[PDB]
Paper text:
We focus on AMGs that potentially encode chitosanase enzymes that metabolize chitin – a common carbon polymer. One expressed protein showing endo-chitosanase activity (V-Csn) is crystalized and structurally characterized at ultra-high resolution, thus representing the structure of a soil viral AMG product. The structure consisted of two non-contiguous structural domains. Our rigorous analyses not only resulted in a crystal structure of a soil viral AMG product, but also enabled us to propose the mode of action of this previously uncharacterized chitosanase enzyme in the GH75 family of glycosyl hydrolases.
Based upon a partial alignment of the V-Csn, A. fumigatus, F. solani, and S. avermitilis sequences, the corresponding residues in V-Csn are D148 and E157. Two V-Csn constructs harboring either a D148N substitution or a E157Q substitution were generated, and the activities of the respective mutant enzymes measured. Activity was reduced five-fold for D148N and almost eliminated for E157Q. Both constructs eluted with gel-filtration chromatography retention times identical to native V-Csn, and circular dichroism spectra indicated both constructs were folded. In both cases the carboxylate was converted to the corresponding amide, generating the mutant proteins D148N and E157Q. The two mutant V-Csn proteins were crystallized under the same conditions as the wild-type protein, and their structures were determined by molecular replacement to high resolution. Superposition of the two mutant structures onto the wild-type apo1 structure gave RMSDs of 0.11 and 0.07 Å, respectively, for all Cα positions, suggesting very little conformational differences between the mutant and the wild-type structures. Structural data from Cel45 and CaCel45 suggest that this acidic residue is the catalytic proton donor in the GH45 enzymes, and given the structural similarity of the DPBB domains in the GH45 and GH75 enzymes, it is highly likely that E157 is the catalytic proton donor in V-Csn.
Residue numbers in the entry: -1 to 224
The structure:
């Protein structure tokens, strides 16, 4: 394809975020890819039983716990017999399905099964949780549609779900996976969805926007500009 016209709109951690001039509206950045296991129902459990170390969700003994919802005494909610991993903690994502209660793993986006990206807090650049994106790994040639599913630290950029890592052929392990190399190009369509909907529906919408925008071929050429 031809090169795209790019206009800087933001910068986080040395990564420039560009509006892609034209329609449909989109922005793009090239960054590393840290693993966000948030929302996976096996991410966190007592005594380091999860796929991540427990302390990466905070203090599970009544202290500051950010991994997910807590009970009235500040301890993480444990999954029930009707939840995917009974006795593990409920891990939360910023994006959620309103059909389920705050204490339910089903309210959150399962990182193991759903391709999702993280955007830095205070750096959404017009995107709303549930909006779609096209994600491309320039070193493997792999790609995947994804939703904006979680919010990261305001000072960090380039992170996504276990399943997105799998789709991109990046090591998906929450404890040692991901990459610091700036090899992932993320094209976000702000204003595209802005709510929870079934993955079949948002994936189809991502496909329609990507076709209108010029397809992976255009993003491949654009990656050489970043």
């Amino acid at each position: 394809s031809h090169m795209s016209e790019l206009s800087e709109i933001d910068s986080v951690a040395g990564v420039t975020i560009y509006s892609v001039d034209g329609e449909p509206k989109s922005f793009v950045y090239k960054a590393g890819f840290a693993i966000d296991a948030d929302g996976a129902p096996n991410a966190y459990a007592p005594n380091n039983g999860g796929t991540d170390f427990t302390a990466n969700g905070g203090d599970d003994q009544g202290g500051d716990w950010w991994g997910g919802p807590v009970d009235a005494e500040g301890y993480p909610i444990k999954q029930k017999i009707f939840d995917p991993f009974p006795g593990y903690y409920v891990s939360a994502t910023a994006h959620f399905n309103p059909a389920y209660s705050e204490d339910s793993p089903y309210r959150y986006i399962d990182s193991n099964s759903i391709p999702f990206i993280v955007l830095p807090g205070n750096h959404s650049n017009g995107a709303k949780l549930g909006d779609v994106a096209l994600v491309y790994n320039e070193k493997t040639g792999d790609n995947c549609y994804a939703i904006y599913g979680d919010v990261g630290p305001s000072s960090k950029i380039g992170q996504g779900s276990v399943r997105l890592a799998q789709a991109l052929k990046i090591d998906d392990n929450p404890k040692a996976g991901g990459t610091e190399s700036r090899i992932v190009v993320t094209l976000v369509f702000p204003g595209s969805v802005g709510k929870w909907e079934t993955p079949k529906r948002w994936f189809s919408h991502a496909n329609q926007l990507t076709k209108a925008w010029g397809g992976l071929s255009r993003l491949k050429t654009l990656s050489d500009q970043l």
